[PDB]
Every structure is written in structure tokens, then in C-alpha cells.
């Protein structure tokens with residue numbers, strides 16, 4: 001039996017590229033990605049599960065935006081940032097990335113949810 | 121935002137004493153317990169979250185049944201066992217305990233679900 005992680009998605013997130021990471025595992029890997037995420041980024045499931053989502057960054061991604069996300073994660077707060085991201089074929093898009101922390105009933109950080117939206 | 125862990129319950133488990141543990145944390149602690157669990161066992165939420173469910177065992181609990189559960193957990197398989205358990209007031213009941221593993225999309229063990237049923 002597999003956890004239905006999507007049961008923890010918000011209504012906005014249902015048609016989207018959305019992912020969950022597990023910060024209690026080494027390197028905060030993605031443990032779930034939606035099919036829209038895989039379609040927009042050009043990857044298969046095998047290529048992305050268990051990896052940190054850093055692989056969407058590329059040669060012209062701003063390193064301060066990357067550090068901003070890292071700090072935002074440490075803060076355990078809701079945040080949104082526009083960051084240049086790339087697909088497997090190397091094509092680039094501005095990603096409006098929204099991240100929020102999700103807690104267990106004890107109030108311990110359990111997952112991060114991330115939603116990607118290409119800015120048009 | 122708190123994960124709705126009960127979204128991962130089976131239909132049988134809805135009216136029951138049911139709990140989830142996190143085996144990736146030290147001592148495989150309960151991260152969720154239903155109100156029926158707290159009512160049947162005589163505890164408050166603060167008294168049980170973050171603890172291993174071993175505290176339901178007591179003076180006449182059979183140590184081989186305890187080891188059977190431990191091995192069943194290591195096996196990552198569905199199992200049921202009748203074990204003598206106790207409430208906070210020291211009263212005892214035969215618990216028909218059913219445990220199953222729950223996996224993430226990668227196929228890694230994520231949680232155990234446990235359902236308690238007093239045998240009448």
C-alpha cells in the first residue's frame with residue numbers, strides 16, 4: 001500500500017506541477033511529483049524520485065535565488081520566488097515557485113510542498 | 121498546516137482505535153492517534169504522541185507476542201496478533217492488533233498503520 005500523498009495537496013495545486021520533499025531524509029529529496037511536474041520538466045518518474053529538486057536549476061539560475069530558497073526552507077515558512085529553471089532538453093523557463101511547510105500532529109516539520117508555475 | 125494523516129486510513133479503520141508510527145524516527149514513535157485510541161486507553165494526546173506504543177503493554181503481556189510484533193515490523197508485512205494490553209488505570213484487555221506497512225511512491229517504507237480492537 002502506497003501513501004496517497006496528493007491527499008495533502010491544496011485545491012490550487014491539483015492541476016499543477018506540485019511536489020513533496022522529505023526534509024528528514026539526506027538532501028531533502030522529492031518523495032512525490034505530479035504528472036504535470038514530469039511533463040513540464042521533461043523527466044520520467046525514475047529520473048526524479050529520491051532526488052533534490054535542484055536539478056531544475058541551470059547555467060543562468062541566480063545563485064542568490066537558490067540561497068533564498070535554502071533560507072526559506074530553514075525558516076519553515078510560506079514563500080514564493082521567481083527562479084530561472086530548465087527542462088531536461090536544456091530549455092529555460094521562469095518558475096514562480098511556491099513552497100510551504102507541512103507539520104505532523106506533534107507540530108514537527110514533516111514535508112515541504114512545492115508548486116511550480118511557469119511565468120508567461 | 122498539519123498533514124491529514126487520517127486520509128491514509130482504510131474504511132475499516134475509520135471508527136476505530138487507529139495509530140500511525142514513523143519508523144524512520146528513533147524508537148518508531150506514534151505520530152498520529154485517533155480519538156478512539158485515546159478514549160479506549162485512558163490517555164491524553166500529549167501523553168502519547170512521540171512515544172512508541174509499547175506503553176500499552178503491562179505486567180502479564182506475553183514477551184513472545186511483543187517479539188512477534190517486532191519481527192512482523194522488520195518483515196514489513198501485514199499481520200494481526202492478540203496481545204494483552206492495559207489502560208492508564210491499569211485495567212487489562214485483549215487487543216486484536218492489526219499492523220500494516222505503508223510505502224512512499226519510491227517504494228520505501230514510510231509509516232506503519234496500527235488498528236486496535238478489544239476482543240470481547
Ligand SMILES: Cc1cc2nc3c(=O)[nH]c(=O)nc-3n(C[C@H](O)[C@H](O)[C@H](O)CO)c2cc1C
Pocket residue numbers: 019020021028052053054056057066067069070073083085095097099112113114115116
Ligand atoms: C518542495 C520543494 C520544491 C522545490 N522545487 C524547486 C523548483 O521547482 N525549482 C528549483 O529551482 N528549486 C526547487 N527547490 C529547491 C531545491 O530543492 C533546494 O532546496 C534549493 O536549491 C536550495 O538548496 C524545491 C525545494 C523543495 C523543498
Ligand SMILES: Cc1cc2nc3c(=O)[nH]c(=O)nc-3n(C[C@H](O)[C@H](O)[C@H](O)CO)c2cc1C
Pocket residue numbers: 139140141148172173174176177186187189190193203205215217219232233234235236
Ligand atoms: C503502528 C503500530 C501500532 C502498534 N500498536 C500497538 C498496540 O496497540 N499494543 C501493543 O502492545 N503494541 C503495539 N505496537 C508495538 C510496539 O510499538 C512495539 O513495536 C513492540 O513492542 C515491539 O518492539 C505497535 C506498533 C506499531 C508500529
